């Protein structure tokens, strides 16, 4: 959602820099900061998913071991 | 895969802008659109993974509860 | 972690290009390569998570089928 907010902000600066191409340098540098911030937020969300996956792994493993032990 | 297509397209424009650095402005602005589109596709795929993780969570939880209830 | 290294490197070039804005073109082109490399590493990590999710799916499915078959 913040990712969606940084992406919508990036789409804005892209229209600006495009319409300015049709001054320009500052907006390109600003747009690179917008892209970096999106990438950084996506990395935060990706790190969460990695840990969520490991936790699911541990949970499935516990069930698998339980079923094995029940034999 | 579309991500891989936007990334290969970004690698192309990077060589262009590099070899043009060795006109340039338009390709930098074009390359920023290539990066934004990659980021946006990656966000689509990341959103899918988030929902896939939640669904796995619900599935494991149902199994855990079943095993608990079977006692 | 490499993602964190490409992102910290991107944050450096952003300060350079900002402080140079306050020559500039080369650093913008360099910064676009930094962003592309971050995006590409994130795509590698995202592809891993996708496969990790599929494998968890197969594992949960095997447990679900086992419990079904035990009836």
Query: According to the 3-state scheme, what is the secondary structure of A11-65?
Result: HHHHHHHHHHHCCHHHHHHHHHHHHHHHHHHHHHHHHHHHHHHHHHHHHHHHHHH
To the nearest 10°, report the CA torsion of A56, A62, A68, A70.
-130
**Cβ distance B27 to B19 under 8 Å?**
no
* Fold for the domain defined by A2-70: Helix Hairpins (1.10.287)
Residues of B in contact with A44 (CB under 8 A): none
Neighbouring chains to B with at least 3 Cβ pairs closer than 8 Å: A, C
Between CA A39 and CA B30 the distance in angstroms is: 18
Whole-number Cα distances in Å, A33 to A13, B56, B71: 11, 35, 56
CA distance C10 to A58: 35
Data resolution in angstroms? 2.1
List the beta strands (DSSP E) in C1-71.
Answer: none
Cβ distance A35 to B39 less than 8 Å, yes or no, reads: yes
C48 is written with which tokens? 């891993």
The answer to whether the beta carbons of residues A41 and A3 sit under 8 Å apart is: yes
Distances (CA, A) of C9 to B15, C5, C6, C29, C33: 20, 6, 5, 14, 11
Chain B partners within 8 Å of A28 (Cβ):
25, 28-29, 32
Distance CA B55, CA B14 (A): 39
- Nearest-CB residue to A46 (from C14, C21, C42): C42
DSSP class of residue B22 equals -
Tokens 């930098």, residue? B28
Could you tell me which residues come within 8 angstroms of residue A54 by beta carbon, excluding any fewer than 6 positions away? Answer: none
Angle at B9 between CA B4 and CA B13, to 5 degrees: 145
Q: Is residue C38 within 8 Å of A39, Cβ to Cβ?
A: yes
Asked if residue B18 lies in contact with residue C29, where contact means CB atoms within 8 angstroms, the answer is yes
Torsion of CA B42, B44, B49, B54, to 10 degrees: 150
C2 to chain A: closest CA residue: A43
Chain B residue closest in CA terms to C47: B45
Q: At what angle do helices B2-21 and B24-70 cross, to 10 degrees?
A: 150
Check A53 against B57: CB less than 8 A apart.
Answer: no
Shortest CA gap A29–chain C (Å): 7
Rounded CA separation A28/A10 (Å): 11
Separation CA C16–CA C26 (nearest Å): 11
Size of interface A-B (CB pairs under 8 A): 64
From the centroid of its chain, how far is CA C41? Answer: 5
Residue A21's alpha-carbon distances to A27, B27, B42, C21, C53, in angstroms, are: 10, 11, 27, 18, 43
């Amino acid at each position: 959602s913040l990712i969606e907010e940084l992406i919508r902000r990036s789409e804005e600066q892209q229209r600006r820099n495009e319409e300015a191409l049709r001054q320009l340098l500052s907006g390109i540098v600003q747009q690179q900061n917008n892209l970096l911030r999106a990438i950084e937020a996506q990395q935060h969300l990706l790190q969460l998913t990695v840990w969520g996956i490991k936790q699911l792994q541990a949970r499935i493993l516990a069930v698998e071991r339980y079923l094995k032990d029940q034999q």
